[PDB]
């Protein structure tokens, strides 16, 4: 019962209208002696999915979703500061608003020994630095919604052009769970949310 009590308290403070929510959440969890890693890698993912399922069933509104995940995003940021050879480039495409999952991915990958650099909406000359050498062993793209899929295909195409097809590109996100075949048009080398498959297929360890 206890783990669901703790998640519900994470969700209740995240969704709640009253301020200071994540400072209060951090105090209560550490007073309960939940360590920082499992706050990061277990509770915040689990509370995020429970918030998502609460929206599926029309029990919380869009703005509650917006404030709760942005708060959990704020908490996850601070926890990863406290607790920390291949390198991947993790790209959040322009106008992609589902961003918590890529933070969870980067911390998972770093824990498995893969260095990650997270970039938001990189242009052609943002990318072109980072592909002019063999600096990154792969690029990773998150995609949350169908209206981002065309922008993701342009990213893969532009990544392919700045390297003549030699940059390996994996795609994950909330789209992959529902409709992974919708990203099969983008020309990525790999469409999965399984990080062990990304790691094995690109040989990142
Ligand atoms: C939270 C959420 C949002 C939040 C985002 C909060 C944030 N800052 O991150 C907000 C409120 C911004 C939001 C709004 C939108 N989103 Co929304 N919302 C959701 C919701 C409820 C949960 C998604 C979530 O956070 N899941 C939990 C996270 C942790 O999982 P994840 O993101 O999938 O990431 C995991 C995996 O995908 C994987 N992973 C992620 N990225 C990558 C990358 C790689 C390379 C790999 C290997 C793995 C990987 O690892 C992660 C952890 O396991 C879902 C519905 C649902 N899923 O139940 C939608 C959903 C994704 N949203 C959707 C939509 C449509 C939107 C909007 C684009 C438009 C709209 N009409 O709402 C807007 C954004 C633009 C706008 N505002 O106009 C749709 C997408 C389907 C579609 N397009 O038809 C969904 C599915 C809801 C729905 N059924 O309508 N959303
Ligand atoms: Cl601490
Ligand atoms: Cl939504
Ligand atoms: Cl980290």
Numbering used by the authors: 0 to 83, 92 to 212
What does the paper say about this structure?
Among purple photosynthetic bacteria, the transcription factor CrtJ is a major regulator of photosystem gene expression. Recently, CrtJ’s activity was shown to be modulated by two size variants of a B12 binding co-regulator called SAerR and LAerR in Rhodobacter capsulatus. The short form, SAerR, promotes CrtJ repression, while the longer variant, LAerR, converts CrtJ into an activator.
In this study, we solved the crystal structure of R. capsulatus SAerR at a 2.25 Å resolution. The solved crystal structure of SAerR containing bound cobalamin has a four-helix bundle cap followed by an α/β Rossman fold. A flexible loop between the four-helix bundle and the α/β Rossman fold is not resolved in the structure. B12 is nestled between the four-helix bundle cap on the left and the Rossman fold on the right. The corrin ring is anchored in place by His145 in the Rossman fold that functions as the lower ligand to the Co in cobalamin. In SAerR, His10 is not present, as this variant is 40 AA shorter at the amino terminus relative to LAerR. In this case, the best fit for an upper axial ligand in the SAerR electron density map is an atom of Cl (dappled ball in Figure 2B,C). SAerR crystals were grown in a high concentration of NaCl, so Cl appears to have replaced the upper ligand –OH that was originally present in hydroxycobalamin that was light-attached to SAerR. Two additional Cl atoms were found in the structure, as well as a molecule of the additive 1,6- hexandiol that we used for the optimization of crystal growth. Analysis of the region near the upper Cl axial ligand shows that it is protected by two aromatic residues, Trp94 and Phe101, in SAerR.
